[PDB]
Ligand binder design. Structure first.
Ligand SMILES: Nc1ncnc2c1ncn2[C@@H]1O[C@H](COP(=O)(O)O)[C@@H](O)[C@H]1O
Ligand SMILES: CCCCCCCCCCCCC/C=C\[C@H](O)[C@H](N)CO
Ligand SMILES: CCCCCCCCCCCCC/C=C\[C@H](O)[C@H](N)CO
Ligand SMILES: [Cl-]
Ligand SMILES: [Cl-]
Ligand SMILES: [K+]
Ligand SMILES: [K+]
Ligand SMILES: [K+]
Ligand SMILES: [K+]
Ligand SMILES: [K+]
Ligand code: NA
Lengths: 297, 242, 58, 245, 49, 242, 49, 99, 58, 48
């Protein structure tokens, strides 16, 4: 029981997030209302105070004499699902015959979509994102040819044994999900749920994954978010003997059922490395085009 | 079996197709979604937020990049001199590329709506002045003098306690939507020009700096929308990203 | 239908309209989102809101 | 009546006679974690007044050539007062913050600082200049503590993103002819209900001059920028011995 | 195997079989084999007029 | 026929796809199911059953394997000495691998919940003692002394008629679920440490053994669940099985 | 899956076939149609001129 | 010694807060754990061979030849179920031929 | 539908929700099981149950 | 930085020429006798 007044009257524990704003339906662009001349003292829409941190509240109607316009222009194409639910390339896997990289007929790809700039720049507009996804696998030879070859794709979550050869016992796939498909078949396609241990994936994590001294050698771990590490994607030609053909698997991802939070400035310098915002210090370029003088076009 | 007949399109992979695909983890339930501040629902929400417009997009050396963020005003000769000019086309190369609006704009082929640029004076409290900011709709060449500029849509700005003023670039187009304007036949979609002139003069007493800067913030009005989703003109990678 | 509530958007303040043929909802199409917006959250997050007609700093 | 203000919390009070309203980040006030969002089962400790109060941590000098600085939260406070102790003894922490940046001059000085809060402010390096070396920033640059850290390349926020768009984040400006402070209230932002105050900085505070400081010879040339902040709704859990990192 | 991509005005036109633009993260592309039936899609009315 | 169009995914064999396949024996009815004791419905039912935790996972020679099942206590010097330590991570290599919980855990990528370890004293009736068992949440290094251990979650155990005591390792995590922890960045998911100290001393009269053993039994609490079904880290075969 | 059986005509492209094809731009709404004089509905309208 | 597991709970060993746990138990059902296709047999049909050079082969149905699947089902003593069998055929190089 | 009761689970104390296109029920999908559990059967199979608060042996 | 840990007021010069610092009653006893060097420092109020 509580008896001293400061305890009774305290707000310690209020779990309700007091919100100053709320969403309104806006299926179309706003309309324009008729306006006329205003010759007044006291009323001054045009004057603002940007220091406050808010954007100007002045509208067309108050700055010029406007007509009435019934705007039926839709806002549907700018929803998160509209912007993001379009398949883009997020991974390429090579399976050569005579090669330096994967001459053994299998390959392991750590799932990380930050290797391609188009897709990456788009998702990095937000800090946190939660979504489901549709993955499509397009396979062919390096010339774009289709050959009668059978492949196995397996999803290996963190902790499951990664295959170490085309004949690894792990390909028994008694629990992991695998897809068996021919290059001659249409691209394989599957749905993936939101799998992070967190409520969202986060393209930016200002911190370290572990405790301890963060000495120079363990600085490559700054920014590493295990909550974003979903595992490995493994592929192999299905046989006990080497395949007769060199292959390429291109991975496309289409997000769906998207939610995003905390928008941020968009990347303006070329990307250099996966999941790390390093930029070339000697080649810092302006965000856009430049001109010779401010008084000339 | 039930009689079916395959139609063209069969087996194709259209990247924008909104279909149904087999789920890899049956009966899997995701981590619950806690409350996170700042959820966004529509890119248009972001287009209404003012970001800095690089009207002064001339310096290019790394050490001077920050100078692009502001432009100056200083005492003149009282001849209604020109202070600065720039195109109002939001999705065209130039000043607007510095803004989030301009960048988001790059993912859409067409846009429609009014724009607004709010100018903040950052000189000293003792500095006064009146500037004339004009918007010249399509067809009007760059105004040669203030008298010509004055014939278009404009705002006469008076420096005072309210540090800023807003110039509205009202939607004045022949078409309902404009595609991105660029040199050539697509100049058909140009929005026009913005020019800033000295209405009176920048005046200051003894003891205060003779030069000061103005910062420009731009965004879209509530009647702004975009359509025909496309890839941006820039791809921020040179070779493979490792 | 009678499926699982697997979707990444289950519990969203905006309702979607989708198609599905599997027992897991995350397999469903993207559908149509609801068209609500809240610009103020980012463009006008001030404690004491000021009018269009007033002088912002008084 | 919008230019004047008083912020009182704990045993501390701040006054200003040249304010520019108050920004509440993403439109929402700090709040304690709900029983449905929570996951850890131990009863939390909510010290209240002993930790939710204003702490004045640092003063920087604004010079005609300053590039700008940043601080990381909650890093700036992990070694200060009762808050610090709690952050060290507990695995889990969560809180909001009221940030009040101070800077006054004269009606004859000029300049404008952009004061903004950027969640998950991951720092990048210049990659050996040529961009061929995959370097990483050292602990002292990622978690600079109370002293903060000076930006090497403000135009790209030392992270390859344009400062010209930083206004998409909760912010205010300190434009000398107008105001002498910025006040921003920030709710707890993260994809988890609680986290480590040591391993993870939820956001960074940036103070960057966009319109350079200027004045005539003879006017006071020392123009300090002081940082004062107060945790709000602090909660801690997962108690054990104190740990500094 | 072929890739068809629709490049609206303003999107980067590919300049080689290996152009980065083929990542097609936003433009619509169709991937189809010559051995498959003809690809077919629906297009809306797209003019600004 | 009815117009159809094949979509990507066509012809693929997804091992986790829950589809319908033609039945090979039409009108076949199976042998009825009689009542059989011990039906299980959910693996979680098994995770709540205590199995022996090999805290003493050091002996490796075949003849000493049984010694891994118990650890000792004996008369000390009264300096609050350390008796044993182990990580609380249930799906990590170590003591937990001996438990059914640990093994089942291996078929899931993520888990969430509280754990419990019940310690049974098997010394003689005449032996008495008080031990302090502590659980150190993440971030706390292995306690150097009892005074440091004592600052975390702990239980002070008194030997008596009730042979056992239970230490609850409450779910104290930043995330709703933890993936399996291991050396490296995944240590982010570590649960913490368990350490056992002498609170007083193991005391015995003349005529009773100076050394006795403790057996540890571990299981999960009722708030424990697992998700993201995966293959176990071990494959118990070397070549083909004949 | 549901038992089907392909019939002749499968895979053919008949130029006058009135079918349904996947849309390339989801959620795209066209420019509104203003009033334009002289709309024609049937070629027969022209044959009478 | 009784043979039962401890009945002690978090609530009685430490001061706890209230937590509304909505974490699902669905993925740990028997069908969730077992209804995932795994390899249970391999049959060779070589041309020039020691084993099946005659173009046919007989396999006695026994799924205990592969450790992944075997270890999982051996967690129980008795099991009753229906099954879906899938047969993936190709040449030893993973090639597909008109056979 | 009107099929045969061939399923390995016909007569189960938990009901399933499945899809099928054949006359034999065992051809049906795995569906969704019911979420009941009985830990006590294995974890607490004692004749005379004891409380949490009591001393187990008295 | 050390001072800042106690009760304090941050004063901004402006039209209002003055500011008030409240020295709240924070004592172990209900009353204090006059403090002075020595054992009576027990009754000291503190420092500004
Ligand atoms: N930010 C916005 N964007 C697009 N349309 C809007 C917006 N705000 C309001 N509207 C529309 O204008 C009407 C509300 O006008 P009002 O009551 O003055 O806010 C609604 O029916 C909306 O469709
Ligand atoms: C049968 C094969 C199925 C393939 C399975 C694909 C699972 C992919 C899950 C989507 C994960 C989203 C991306 C997450 C994180 C980022 O890529 C980086 N780690 C950021 O650091
Ligand atoms: C048209 C081809 C259909 C193939 C028919 C496959 C029938 C298989 C029945 C499943 C039998 C389950 C496994 C039974 C026993 C174990 O494998 C071992 N005998 C245990 O000793
Ligand atoms: Cl444009
Ligand atoms: Cl673990
Ligand atoms: K409207
Ligand atoms: K599909
Ligand atoms: K089938
Ligand atoms: K079609
Ligand atoms: K529950
Ligand atoms: Na106004």
């Amino acid at each position: 029981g509580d008896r001293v007044a400061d305890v009774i009257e305290s707000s310690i524990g209020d779990s309700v997030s007091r919100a100053l704003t709320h969403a309104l339906p806006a299926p179309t662009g706003q309309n324009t209302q008729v306006s006329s001349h205003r010759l007044d003292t006291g009323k001054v829409p045009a004057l603002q105070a940007a220091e406050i941190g808010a954007s100007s509240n002045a509208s067309d109607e108050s700055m010029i004499e406007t007509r009435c316009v019934l705007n039926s222009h839709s806002t549907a194409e700018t929803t998160l699902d509209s912007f993001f639910s379009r398949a883009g390339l997020v991974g390429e896997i090579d399976l050569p015959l005579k090669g330096t990289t994967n001459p053994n007929g299998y390959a392991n790809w750590d799932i990380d979509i930050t290797g391609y700039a188009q897709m990456r720049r788009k998702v990095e507009l937000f800090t946190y994102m939660r979504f489901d996804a549709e993955f499509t696998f397009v396979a062919c030879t390096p010339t774009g040819e289709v050959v009668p070859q059978l492949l196995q794709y397996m999803f290996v979550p963190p902790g499951a044994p990664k295959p170490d050869s085309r004949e690894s016992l792990a390909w028994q796939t008694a629990t992991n999900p695998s897809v068996f498909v021919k290059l001659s078949d249409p691209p394989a396609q599957v749905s993936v749920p939101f799998m992070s241990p967190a409520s969202a994936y986060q393209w930016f994590y200002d911190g370290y994954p572990t405790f301890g001294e963060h000495k120079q050698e363990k600085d490559l771990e700054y920014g590493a978010m295990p909550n974003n590490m979903m595992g490995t994607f493994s592929v192999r030609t299905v046989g006990t003997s080497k395949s007769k053909y060199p292959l390429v698997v291109r991975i496309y991802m289409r997000m769906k059922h998207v939610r995003a939070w905390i928008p941020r400035p968009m990347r303006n310098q070329n990307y250099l490395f996966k999941a790390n915002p390093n930029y070339a210090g000697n080649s810092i370029k302006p965000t856009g085009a430049s001109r010779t003088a401010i008084t000339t076009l | 079996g039930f009689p079916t007949e395959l139609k063209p399109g069969t087996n194709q992979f259209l990247t924008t197709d909104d279909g149904v695909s087999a789920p890899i983890l049956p009966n899997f339930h995701p981590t619950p979604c806690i409350h996170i501040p700042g959820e966004v629902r529509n890119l248009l929400e972001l287009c209404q937020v003012e970001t800095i417009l690089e009207v002064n997009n001339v310096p290019t050396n790394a050490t001077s990049l920050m100078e692009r963020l502001r432009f100056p005003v200083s005492a003149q000769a009282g001849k209604g001199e020109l202070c600065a000019v720039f195109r109002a086309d939001p999705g065209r190369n130039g000043p607007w590329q510095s803004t989030l609006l301009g960048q988001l704009c790059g993912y859409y082929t067409q846009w429609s709506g009014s724009l607004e640029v709010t100018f903040m004076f950052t000189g000293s409290f003792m500095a006064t002045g009146k500037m004339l900011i004009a918007y010249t709709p399509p067809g009007g060449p760059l105004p040669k003098d203030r008298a010509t500029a004055m014939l278009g849509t404009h705002v006469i700005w008076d420096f005072g306690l309210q540090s800023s003023v807003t110039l509205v670039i009202p939607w004045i187009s022949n078409t309902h939507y404009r595609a991105h304007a660029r040199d050539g036949v697509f100049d058909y979609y140009t929005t026009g020009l913005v020019s800033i002139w000295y209405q009176t003069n920048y005046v200051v007493p003894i003891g205060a700096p003779n030069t000061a800067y103005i910062i420009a913030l731009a965004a879209a009005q509530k009647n702004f929308t975009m359509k025909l989703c496309k890839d941006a003109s820039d791809i921020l990678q040179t070779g493979t990203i490792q | 239908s009678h499926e699982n509530s697997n979707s990444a958007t289950e519990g969203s303040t905006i309702n979607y309209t989708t198609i599905n043929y599997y027992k897991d909802s995350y397999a469903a199409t993207a559908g149509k989102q609801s068209l609500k917006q809240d610009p103020d959250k980012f463009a006008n997050p001030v404690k004491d809101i000021f009018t269009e007609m007033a002088a912002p700093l008084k | 009546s919008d230019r004047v203000a008083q912020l009182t919390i704990g045993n501390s009070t701040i006054t200003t006679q040249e304010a520019a309203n108050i920004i509440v980040g993403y439109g929402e006030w700090p709040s304690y974690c709900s029983d449905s969002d929570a996951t850890a089962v131990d009863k939390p400790t909510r010290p209240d007044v002993s930790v939710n109060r204003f702490y004045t941590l640092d003063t920087k000098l604004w010079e005609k050539s300053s590039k700008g600085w940043y601080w990381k939260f909650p890093d700036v406070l992990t070694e200060t007062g009762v808050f610090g102790q709690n952050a060290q003894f507990h695995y889990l922490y969560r809180s909001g913050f009221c940030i009040h940046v101070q800077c006054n001059a004269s009606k004859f000085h000029q300049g404008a600082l952009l004061v903004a809060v950027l969640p998950e402010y991951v720092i990048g390096t210049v990659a050996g200049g040529t961009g061929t070396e995959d370097t990483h920033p050292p602990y002292k640059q990622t978690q600079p503590g109370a002293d903060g850290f000076e930006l090497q390349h403000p135009y790209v926020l030392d992270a390859g993103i344009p400062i010209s768009q930083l206004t998409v984040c909760p912010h205010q400006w300190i434009n000398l002819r107008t105001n002498n402070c910025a006040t921003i209230i920030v709710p707890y932002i993260n994809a988890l209900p609680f986290d480590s105050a040591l391993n993870h900085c939820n956001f960074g505070l940036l103070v960057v001059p966009i319109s350079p400081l200027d004045y005539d010879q003879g006017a006071t040339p020392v123009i300090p920028i002081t940082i004062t902040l107060a945790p709000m709704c602090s909660e801690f859990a997962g108690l054990r011995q104190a740990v500094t990192q």
